[PDB]
Design a protein around this motif. Sequence first.
Motif: not given
Length: 340
Positions: A308-323
Amino acid sequence: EQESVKEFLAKAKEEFLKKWESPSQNTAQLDHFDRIKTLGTGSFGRVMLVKHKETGNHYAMKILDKQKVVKLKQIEHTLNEKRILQAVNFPFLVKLEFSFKDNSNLYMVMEYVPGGEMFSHLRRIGRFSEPHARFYAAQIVLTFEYLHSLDLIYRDLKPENLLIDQQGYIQVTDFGFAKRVKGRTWTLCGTPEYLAPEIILSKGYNKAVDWWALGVLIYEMAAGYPPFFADQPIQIYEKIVSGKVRFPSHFSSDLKDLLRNLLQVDLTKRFGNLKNGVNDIKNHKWFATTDWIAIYQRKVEAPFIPKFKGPGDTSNFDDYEEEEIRVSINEKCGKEFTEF
Ligand SMILES: C[N+](C)(C)C[C@H](O)CC(=O)O
């Protein structure tokens, strides 16, 4: 157990009980945070990466919709989750930093672990070697020793609930089914593949269900799939209650022996629930190489560090519709959630 362990656990329980009896409440508010990204979503809640606008710290904010919690009969469970989380303190439990509620939702603001879920890593790699599985298993053993000494049952052990931190260690997240129980409890909860027979059979059950689930987890980590698979829940349940498990030939003899004792259908014969308690597990040959104190102190080099690239990196989680995070102009379910 050495007096050293007894005294450690006595202090652990003292500190837990003080917080348990006087829970923290209302320690932040929503507009202190910026929303970054949805990390997970379910039938009554979501987890969102947020950033505190003054400190710049990232957090994982669990948001529960009070009306959906009521509809899905999760009131007591959500109250359990928050009251327990604000009171516990252990190296392998995610920390709750803030909690609060508003007209519509409950909020638990926890440390953000950017490494992602063990589930993703396990599925990516296929299966963990025995040393790698053992490293994680030892952390769960110590975590359950801690929780059970506080009269807490966890009730949701599975790879999705185990985050991998920046040092490669586990952080248990999701206390939605955790409960303080002296004796037995009765609620049907947990994921099918991980349920102990006594839950399936609608019995009054106790902390032995967590030790069963550890057997399932160890099997799944070492094999790459859980011991009781099938297409319908009822077929999984038939396998669980049957008293039969098959092991891959690559499993060591010590691993098989430990698993037969954790996956013991008779709860009165299950490791972790005998007169010697957790020590039957800690002293088992499969754990002969484990330095329990060094694991607790986080002095063992981990099997891997997530990328991971840093404390804000979300790459290891997946993508969801933003509600939207909508907050009603009117208070909902105030009475039910008074203590939150
Ligand atoms: C930069 N600072 C200290 C505000 C935050 C750290 O990067 C940790 C974080 O982002 O959670």
